[PDB]
């Protein structure tokens, strides 16, 4: 049934990981024609992290592989609109694009890590 | 016709200039090999050089000469064709980056292309039938090799002049006679 979530109940059996996340509120510029985005209250949510396993390419005697996660959760994550995206970190900052389920019961993920984390307890 | 033995010929000057690099520029080793080999073989790891014919160019209308041949009373017509032949020489060598002394192929490429255009090697290849023009450039390009280690393949044109000979059958005259009319 498209009623009860089912990842609530998956979650009860597999066992999951946890990652903070935080989201997205609006967006300035600096006096360069450039956005710098504003995020608030990163909260503590629960998640299973999957495998995708990137491969790398070449633009010219460079190599730049790009890493990439599959996410599964039961929240309203949104990828990209006339907004921007929301943020998260399992070891380092990470961004997704995508959508799933939402206005049901759960959705889905991805993720770009992202550099680094800044430290003192894993900002 | 005429085209065996220039590879035969080519081939040795090669030879003898890869041996003139070898004590110019302390190589491990050489090998000097063809393009578009006709059966199935693979590259090998040592310093390489490979050449490949690219076209050709008449360059001139034919000469005609005629010798006669007197027991049998024929002309033996010769045709002379002066062509140009377009060669593209090639060489290949891996870098390791952690021995001090270096040597990269661009400085074989660039050996060999000099040693071509020496005086003294033009004059010892006249007696050889054939002749070299000027060249113009020469150019790097990055291959992949084994899904790494990225290489490059320098590369150049080389023109050789020569002559090449036809020959066939013709009849002879011996006399003429005419008839005037008023």
Same mark, same amino acid.
């Given at each position: 049934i498209p009623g009860a979530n089912l990842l609530r109940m998956a979650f009860g059996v597999i066992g999951t990981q946890i990652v903070r996340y935080r989201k997205?509120? *609006?967006?300035?510029?600096?006096? =360069?024609? *450039?956005? @710098?985005?504003?995020?608030?209250?990163?909260?503590?949510?629960?998640?299973?992290?999957?495998? !995708?396993?990137?491969? =790398?390419?070449? *633009?010219?005697?460079?190599?730049? =592989?790009?890493?990439? @996660?599959?996410?599964?959760?039961?929240?309203?994550? !949104?990828?990209?609109?006339?907004?921007m995206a929301g943020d998260q970190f399992l070891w380092t900052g990470r961004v997704f694009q995508l959508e799933s389920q939402g206005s049901w019961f759960y959705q889905d993920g991805w993720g770009v890590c992202l550099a680094v984390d800044i430290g003192a307890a894993k900002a | 016709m005429f085209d065996g033995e220039l590879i035969a010929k080519l081939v040795v000057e090669l030879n003898a200039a890869m041996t003139s690099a070898q004590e110019a520029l302390q190589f491990p080793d050489f090998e000097v090999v063809q393009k578009a080999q006709p059966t199935q073989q693979g590259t090998s790891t040592r310093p390489t050089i490979f050449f490949q014919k690219l076209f &050709?160019?008449?360059?001139?209308?034919?000469?005609? &000469?005629?010798?006669? &041949?007197?027991?049998?009373?024929?002309?033996?017509? +010769?045709?002379?064709?002066?062509?140009?032949?377009?060669?593209? +020489?090639?060489?290949?060598?891996?870098? /390791?980056?952690?021995?001090?002394?270096?040597?990269?192929?661009?400085?074989?490429? /660039?050996?060999?292309?000099?040693?071509?255009?020496?005086?003294?090697?033009?004059?010892?290849?006249?007696?050889?039938?054939?002749?070299?023009?000027?060249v113009s450039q020469i150019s790097n390009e990055a291959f992949e090799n084994d899904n790494?280690?990225?290489?490059?393949?320098?590369?150049? &044109?080389?023109?050789?002049?020569? /002559?090449?000979?036809?020959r066939l059958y013709e009849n002879a005259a011996y006399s003429a006679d005419g008839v005037l009319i008023g």
């Open positions: 997205f509120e *609006q967006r300035v510029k600096n006096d =360069q024609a *450039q956005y @710098v985005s504003m995020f608030g209250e990163p909260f503590d949510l629960a998640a299973s992290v999957q495998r !995708v396993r990137r491969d =790398q390419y070449a *633009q010219f005697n460079l190599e730049f =592989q790009r890493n990439y @996660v599959m996410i599964f959760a039961n929240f309203d994550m !949104v990828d990209l609109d006339r907004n | &050709d160019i008449p360059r001139g209308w034919p000469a005609t &000469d005629w010798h006669l &041949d007197n027991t049998a009373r024929k002309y033996v017509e +010769i045709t002379r064709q002066h062509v140009e032949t377009t060669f593209q +020489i090639s060489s290949l060598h891996w870098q /390791n980056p952690e021995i001090t002394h270096v040597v990269t192929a661009s400085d074989i490429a /660039n050996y060999v292309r000099a040693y071509f255009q020496a005086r003294s090697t033009i004059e010892r290849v006249k007696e050889l039938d054939f002749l070299i023009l000027r790494h280690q990225f290489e490059f393949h320098p590369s150049f &044109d080389m023109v050789v002049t020569y /002559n090449q000979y036809i």
